[PDB]
Design a protein around this nucleic acid. Structure first.
Lengths: 521, 493, 12
DNA sequence: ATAAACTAAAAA
DNA sequence: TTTTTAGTTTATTG
């Protein structure tokens, strides 16, 4: 279930060449690599990582001979990444003065996978190239190179300083050389040859890579799915398999409380003490303590033994349909829980796949949804939610989101604003906010494509909490005397709106400031 | 602890049904009060309740004022209290009321409201008058003016007077009487004009509408820009109601026991002496409690306007955690409501949501939220079903979106789709958010209710979350067998 | 002219 | 591995 | 002081 990853970094002279204000492709690539290794180290993934550098001053690789595979160094052999590898990216690895053949480097990387995976058992094989393509190269036996990648089942991902208005901001939302242009076409051809038309999507810019999880895309562990049955009435039972589509990714590791001198968990102990609520408190016996519940004013003694027998006994795990209603009746404001389930058709079952497909399309065409009852097991508490259609070109499924019970709902009354004489804005005030929304719009529409383009897709940005934690964890591990470092600028750049949105908003914001008076109490 | 008093009219007109299968105005009141009492125990509200009757022959009050019966003084809801209310529920229950105390007796609203006010003597003070008489003291000019004076006196004290007008032949008129009696808000937009109650479901919803006080989850700053800052209140209009936590008691006394969780050394037996650790392989990383919070810190508490994303780009899935409600807070920043209104009006007009970087509290990482423009909506009963403001929609990060197992697309024939359309059309129903009750909670409180009243036999309820199997099978007999034959072959497992 | 290449024995 | 329950902390 | 949210911990089932 582990993956063999080889990171192929260009350290050539041209990677060090920087344009004022813009970070050198070498420093950019270093930041992307550190981002990758930090996740693999601190998330304690069992994936083995190797590191090959091309354009080094010296030559240290198994294919090195005469003029073949020159200026390529195998910095790290295939093994679980550690703090020593991270320390090397941070300060040990320096840019070189020579230039190497990126295809020669790709072969060295391929040779690493072929020889170092002999003993071990890997589910996925992956190579990540980080280059500027400014260096000269040979197309000799390229057709075989592409073929061997297919035969060995090794995937590729390219990372360039450029991607396929205003100022440059790394992580934010002049002219490529003829050698880079020539190099790019071979990269395109190779990617199309490996992953088809959609292969071009696997060529990223260093900047966008920092604000995406694309570096892990190919070595990402498959989602755990579970089977159940969708039951319309009693006689009909469609065989399904649902998994958690959305689930909040939270911090895995916990901060263990240790003594300041010894630095051990064992020396610290938590003990519970019991005392009476009445005046002049006395110690209460740990064995004599009985479970109880409040019923308003009354205090009812109810033991765990009697509770298990008298409690609500669920009829069992199911995905039973209660009824069907129009799309308009189910409002997003009533969605509940901490997950989204995608109800897919049972794997290796053709008849159940058509049976679910019939329901998906019937609900879509009629503009209707399905109110269903859900429980993962017989012990679990029952839920009532919406099951709505979701049809895309490649896949077809129902989407389950939990809905509320009467007890969950809260009813408050808020003052009307539509015709409030005291708070009604003037025609000039409304026309000022109208200009603000037009200036601060996060979407662009091309009339030829007639498709709406999002300029701030947040769902693509990774949670800054993790890479910030990893930064601090690594900094304390390598530099214990120094205090915590500040948040990296690229993390702030990816969280803030595009510079064009910020610049456009300047003029209407100053206008709404004067028109709308605001003061503290 | 807020005080709420239920005042019920017990005149001859209150015990007469409008020649229908529907309950008498008195029966509706008794059941509505009982429903609130039960709801307050489930929701664990600390509120104090009372039950006062007028127009009864038998009088029970502080100064023995004629025809006023104070059934229950101001106190927390109880199992024995609900049981007392159940003795008047129904036609047989109506008989028990007439026997214990009289009915259709001459009253004086001035004295009635005075007794009610005197019950509060022992935060918010509220009286809810359940009556079907549009013009009491219509014949008596003196009694009518005296009632207006005491009603005025209550309002000047801070006591709220709310009318729960019930179905009366030829309609109920507010202009004749009660227009001056009722508590009206200073703002024309704030006051709600409910219609007369005919059903128990409408009455109970109107009572809980006026009763409830707005509870803001947090009051945050909505920063348009570094200098343009309005103040908003974040309200949780939906919150998962869970089983109440148990209380550790004693086997003999049955009184609560306070728990003291003490943390101390093992070798010897302060927070300065503690440090935090995380061990990765052989390496141990050491951080102070201040440092562990310093890394979590981004921005400052409040909402930061990123821009405006059209609603079409926001997908129906991408649900992370339950949505919140954003409403302005004029009490903190003056002029917030005007700018909020301007933003709401223009966002609805342009069909666009306000994208923000939400930080609820200090030293917490941010999350991108979309403030969806919510227009005001009032139902047929004139109750605000949808408040005006913004819906705080939590958006997931790249990490929260899980990878999907890539499956082959198999599409159904138009004949198969057409048959499923007929199945859907026949099983059609009208969904309400309040259609279902939590079966785990309902059974839990049914068990505690019987246990409090020392009843050995617990009332075993029927699960509403289960589908009406027989009713669905009755609606579709041929269609199920017809569809199964079309998609599933006879050799299917 | 193009630079000649010697592929690893396993590729051939 | 997933869900529920209990405990602790922070803000109304 | 009480309520809500988040993080551990425990138990059960596949």
């Amino acid at each position: 279930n582990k993956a063999a990853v080889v990171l192929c970094m260009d350290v050539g002279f041209t990677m060090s060449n920087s344009i004022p204000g813009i970070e050198s492709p070498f420093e950019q690539a270093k930041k992307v690599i550190t981002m990758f290794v930090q996740r693999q180290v601190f998330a304690e993934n069992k994936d083995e990582i190797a590191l090959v550098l091309f354009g080094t001053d010296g030559t240290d690789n198994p294919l090195s001979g005469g003029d073949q595979y020159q200026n390529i160094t195998v910095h790290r052999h295939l093994m679980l990444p550690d703090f020593d590898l991270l320390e090397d990216i941070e300060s040990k690895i320096q840019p070189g003065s020579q230039q190497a053949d990126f295809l020669d480097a790709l072969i060295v990387s391929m040779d690493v996978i072929q020889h170092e995976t002999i003993g071990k058992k890997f589910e996925k094989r992956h190579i990540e190239i980080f280059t500027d393509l400014s260096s000269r190269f040979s197309k000799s036996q390229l057709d075989i190179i592409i073929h061997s990648l297919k035969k060995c089942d090794i995937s590729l991902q390219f990372f360039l300083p450029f991607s396929l208005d205003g100022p440059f901001r790394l992580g934010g939302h002049k002219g490529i050389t003829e050698q880079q242009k020539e190099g790019l076409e071979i990269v395109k051809m190779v990617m199309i040859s490996l992953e088809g038309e959609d292969g071009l999507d696997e060529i990223y810019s260093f900047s966008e890579s920092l604000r995406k999880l694309c570096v892990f895309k190919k070595i990402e562990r498959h989602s755990i799915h579970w089977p159940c049955r969708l039951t319309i009435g009693s006689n009909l039972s469609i065989r399904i398999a649902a998994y958690k589509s959305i689930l909040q990714e939270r911090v895995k590791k916990t901060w263990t409380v240790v003594d300041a001198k010894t630095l051990k968990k064992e020396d610290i102990q938590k003990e519970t003490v019991y005392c009476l609520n009445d005046d002049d408190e006395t110690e209460v016996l740990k064995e004599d303590i009985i479970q109880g519940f409040r019923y308003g004013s009354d205090i009812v003694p109810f033991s765990k033994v009697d509770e298990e027998q008298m409690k609500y006994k669920s009829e069992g795990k199911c995905f039973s349909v209660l009824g069907f209603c129009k799309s308009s009746q189910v409002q997003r404001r009533f969605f509940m829980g901490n997950q989204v389930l995608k109800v897919f058709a049972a794997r290796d079952d053709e008849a159940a796949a058509v049976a679910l497909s019939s329901l998906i399309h019937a609900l879509d065409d009629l503009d209707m949804v399905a109110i269903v009852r859900y429980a993962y097991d017989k012990r679990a508490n029952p839920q009532v939610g919406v099951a709505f259609p979701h049809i895309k070109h490649n896949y077809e499924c129902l989407v389950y989101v939990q809905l509320p019970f009467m007890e969950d709902l809260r009813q408050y009354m808020f003052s009307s604003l539509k015709n409030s004489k005291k708070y009604a804005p003037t025609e000039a005030q409304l026309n000022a906010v109208d200009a603000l929304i037009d200036s601060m719009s996060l979407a662009k529409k091309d009339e030829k494509t007639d498709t709406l383009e999002d300029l701030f897709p947040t769902t693509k940005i990774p949670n800054p909490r993790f890479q910030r934690l990893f930064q601090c964890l690594l900094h304390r591990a390598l530099h214990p005397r120094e205090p915590l470092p500040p948040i990296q600028q690229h993390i702030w750049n990816m969280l803030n709106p595009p510079a064009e949105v910020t610049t456009k908003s300047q003029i209407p914001l100053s206008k709404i400031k004067t028109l709308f008076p605001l003061i503290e109490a | 602890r807020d005080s709420l008093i239920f005042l019920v009219d017990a005149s001859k007109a209150m015990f007469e049904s409008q020649s229908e299968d529907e309950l008498t105005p008195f029966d509706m009141s008794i059941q509505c009060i009982q429903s609130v009492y039960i709801s307050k125990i489930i929701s664990s509200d600390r509120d104090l309740l009372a039950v006062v009757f007028y127009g009864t022959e038998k009088d029970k009050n502080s100064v023995n004022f004629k025809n006023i019966y104070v059934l229950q003084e101001l106190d927390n809801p109880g199992a024995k209290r609900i049981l007392e209310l159940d003795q008047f529920k129904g036609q047989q229950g109506q008989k028990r009321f007439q026997d214990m105390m009289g009915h259709g007796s001459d009253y004086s609203l001035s004295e009635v409201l005075w007794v009610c006010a005197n019950l509060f003597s022992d935060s918010h003070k509220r009286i809810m008058l359940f009556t079907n008489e549009d013009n009491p003291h219509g014949n008596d000019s003196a009694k009518a003016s005296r009632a207006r004076t005491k009603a005025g006196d209550l309002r000047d004290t801070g006591i709220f007077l709310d009318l729960m007008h019930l179905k009366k032949p030829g309609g109920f008129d507010i202009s004749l009487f009660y227009r001056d009696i009722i508590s009206i808000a200073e703002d024309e937009d704030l006051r709600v004009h409910f219609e007369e109650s005919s059903k128990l479901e409408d009455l109970l919803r109107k009572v809980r509408a006026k009763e409830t006080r707005k509870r803001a989850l947090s009051r945050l700053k909505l920063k348009l820009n570094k200098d343009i800052v309005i103040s908003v209140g974040i309200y949780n209009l939906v919150q998962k109601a869970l089983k109440p936590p148990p209380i550790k008691l004693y086997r003999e006394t049955n009184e609560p026991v306070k728990t003291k969780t003490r943390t101390f050394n093992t070798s010897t037996g302060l927070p300065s002496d503690t440090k935090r650790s995380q061990i990765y392989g052989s390496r141990q990383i050491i951080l102070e409690k201040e440092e562990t919070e310093e890394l979590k810190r981004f921005d400052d508490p409040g909402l930061m306007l990123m821009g405006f994303k059209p609603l079409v780009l926001l997908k129906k899935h991408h649900y992370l955690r339950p949505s919140l409600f954003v409403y302005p807070e004029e009490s903190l920043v003056i002029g917030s409501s005007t700018l909020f209104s301007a933003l709401l009006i223009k966002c609805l007009e342009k069909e666009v949501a306000a994208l923000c970087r939400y930080t609820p509290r200090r030293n917490i990482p941010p999350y991108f939220v979309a403030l969806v423009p919510q227009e005001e909506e009032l139902d047929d009963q004139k109750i605000q079903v949808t408040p005006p403001g913004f819906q705080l929609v939590f958006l997931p990060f790249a990490d929260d979106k899980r990878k999907m197992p890539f499956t082959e697309k198999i599409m159904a024939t138009p004949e198969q789709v057409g048959k499923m359309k007929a199945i859907v059309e026949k099983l059609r129903f009208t969904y309400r958010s309040d259609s279902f009750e939590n079966p785990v909670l309902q059974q839990h409180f049914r068990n505690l209710e019987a246990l409090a009243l020392d009843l050995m036999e617990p009332e075993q309820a029927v699960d509403l979350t289960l589908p009406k199997v027989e009713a669905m099978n009755k609606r579709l007999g041929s269609l199920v067998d017809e569809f199964k034959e079309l998609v599933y072959p006879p050799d299917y497992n | 002219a193009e630079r000649k290449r010697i592929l690893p024995t396993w590729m051939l």
